[PDB]
Amino acid sequence: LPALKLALEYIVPAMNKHGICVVDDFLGKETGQQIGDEVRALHDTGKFTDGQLVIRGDKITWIEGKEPGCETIGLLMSSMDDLICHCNGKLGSYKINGRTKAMVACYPGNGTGYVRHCDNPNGDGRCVTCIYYLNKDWDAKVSGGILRIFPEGKAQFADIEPKFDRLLFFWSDRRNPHEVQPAYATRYAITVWYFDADERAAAKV
């Protein structure tokens, strides 16, 4: 899959038309596994704390990608960034000029999850959500942990399985209310949000 062509050819039309975009097998088996190993490596540290709101049953940690031993995570973020900036101007009307750090989040199992919410209800500047799923051979039927999105204007449901090496894009605003149904198995994911310049200016005001 040509990196920069995938954007204009799939992610851009998919996101504009339907509002959600999924890219399976983004990097490959060995890459994804190196990411997972680095993540669980971080998981043994014990530096994970409870997730925060602007209910949610995950423990997370922020990664900038510049940390030693997180080289592969940084590689991922560099890819996502290259894609975004390459898209810039084409995604809806957005002009993306920033992003958050990476949120490495873990659901312990035990049925905890994230109640129905919206990532940017108040217009804080976040216009796109990216989530990288690295959970290998995840059996949703028994493991739950499904991401259910309720698209605005569409009658159908959007059910995302946290499959390993899966990349997820969607509008962060009120167009995509989502929830993480109870997870009965360890559920790891890496997130990052992308900021629109103008809306970002509005939030300061």
Partner: peptide
Amino acid sequence: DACTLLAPAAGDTIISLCF
């Protein structure tokens, strides 16, 4: 509107991007 105000903390810093 099926939204809720229970948004994930956007975090602490923002990273410059593209320009």
